[PDB]
Amino acid sequence: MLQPKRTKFRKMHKGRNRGLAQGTDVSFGSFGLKAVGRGRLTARQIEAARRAMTRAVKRQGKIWIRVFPDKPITEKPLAVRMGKGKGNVEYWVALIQPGKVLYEMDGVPEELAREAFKLAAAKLPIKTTFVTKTVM
Amino acid sequence: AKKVQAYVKLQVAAGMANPSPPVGPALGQQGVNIMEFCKAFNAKTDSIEKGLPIPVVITVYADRSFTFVTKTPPAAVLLKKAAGIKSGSGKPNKDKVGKISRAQLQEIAQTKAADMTGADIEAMTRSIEGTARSMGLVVED
Amino acid sequence: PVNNRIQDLTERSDVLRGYLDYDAKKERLEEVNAELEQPDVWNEPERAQALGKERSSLEAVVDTLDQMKQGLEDVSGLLELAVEADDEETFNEAVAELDALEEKLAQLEFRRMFSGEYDSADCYLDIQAGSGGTEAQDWASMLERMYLRWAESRGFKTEIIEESEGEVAGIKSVTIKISGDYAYGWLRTETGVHRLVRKSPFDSGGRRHTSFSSAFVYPEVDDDIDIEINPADLRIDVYRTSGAGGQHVNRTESAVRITHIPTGIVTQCQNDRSQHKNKDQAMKQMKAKLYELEMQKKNAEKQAMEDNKSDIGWGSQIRSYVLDDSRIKDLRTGVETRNTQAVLDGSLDQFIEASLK
């Protein structure tokens, strides 16, 4: 499970998904998955996606992970009166603005990559599109 | 000419009399029995070459007797006495296990004049070369 | 020197041969080939599957031990020509295919140590002292030392884990771990109660003693703490808490019962006020009970396995260490060793192969 090593702080604000993506263009590999819908990827989700893509590949080529869960979600225990401070850190999310290329891949056919990214999309919460490596 | 009734292409070494451990029930299944593969199969063996897996036609008949004309021995088994090596694929082009010369290949080719439907010897030679390459023997030019 | 080794190998093969039934398995193979050579054998798939593989497994023994007898002779003949004519290459080619034969023999030897689910795994042995009071203790320590010597000779890490020393001198109970390649295979056949006859040094009148000490050998198992029970296997049901609380407890589904679907084990809880604490507490309790169920079933299976071994009885008395007459007679060996001092110094090679057979 992908979780930050050393933390400056334990808890955080809910924040806003407001804005546009910075990790937009396909950088490393040949075939990437761009995020159409804005949202948040939990750490578990990410791992599931990774699993899906590994299975799709059947151990083949090289896969990149541009995204990483930077913000923790603090959830209160079940059936608690609203006050008494913040809850406890349960899982880690990365806030996804529209346009974020999530996972990149090379060494495989395009169709195969697409298939992999379909599986990944199934695991993931948000709507996505397949993109290729761009010159300039 | 009569249409195809029943055939099962299953043969082993020509030197061995009566195929029964490797092939088994397959040859003696439909019409022609097990015992008709030691007197008929060894009769055509003596004329050409002994101790080599050569395929033979087994067009089965209702009259128990079957017609057979054997071909010239395969490229897979002719490329063993002149090739030098025994082992083939698995790790063929990953690491070179044997060596093959073009002249040798050509020589091997010339024997199968009746086996292959071809107008020229060069074509046959190149087919043989291809076969060798497939097996795992890299052609030396 | 090399030619005499060939003969030894041949002898070894021959002795192996009788037990593995060369005259019976070759006959067995005759009957399979009588039915399976006929095209109409796949009327019954169920039986044919069990026989088809069996025959294939038996062909790799009978025919190979025939290729051994055929092999040794040829190599010997190969050797003879070279030495006589002072040729060198054939000498080297005579050793290299004799070499194959040893490996084959090992494989067949390995096949004896292959039979069973646990063989190559880590190994434990408990040497429990008998009823002798002091003599038994003395025996146990000796046994331990012998085992250690054997371990040293074979080439294994020997780790004494528990060691309860004797009240006067010796060992009351000792557990040693022996790790390595097929470590349990050599030691599985050593399991049993050891009959020691001796003129004791602890007896003031110097009586002769029939003494016993168990050497129970068992393999190290995979831990397997608890299987993660998926929500499809649990049946979660909520209801009202029994008792007092006005309008509140009368109107709560706080109490929970969890039932394991295939088993039938049911765990309830109505302790805490919240449903959600109870659900996870009664699951924690449910998990605990599942472990017990799995622990208890494993223990009963063990119990039943050991009650088989109990009904062997006097057969547990395996190897009679007649030290008062030097000779040692193991029940399955049928042979006596006149050098007790070598036996005690870890040379049980004469006893492993015979007891395994």
Place this chain on the structure above:
Amino acid sequence: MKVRASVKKLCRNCKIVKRDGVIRVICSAEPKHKQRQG
């Protein structure tokens, strides 16, 4: 006839059909592979 929300052509013989609203799959070769959105 399977109950689905995703009616995918699992093989070549599978045939997508909209029968007055309801989306359906029917396979000629396989009786299992026929599906229904519901």
Place this chain on the structure above:
RNA sequence: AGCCAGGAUGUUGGCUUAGAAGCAGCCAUCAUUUAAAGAAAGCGUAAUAGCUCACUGGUCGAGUCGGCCUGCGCGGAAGAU
């Protein structure tokens, strides 16, 4: 888009696996006759044999194929007088 036949041989490519010849698995994945035929794509045999497809010569006679681009539409879509 239909239909008529071929759709292979050198070949059983080879190495293999309780049984694999395209199909428990691993790799080569070249050439012959060529109008085409993959060392065979999906069914199927105990492995073979067999049913087909990619492709190929004819017939039929005009547009057809899959991408995104959104506009709207279905399903997905079930409650209690």
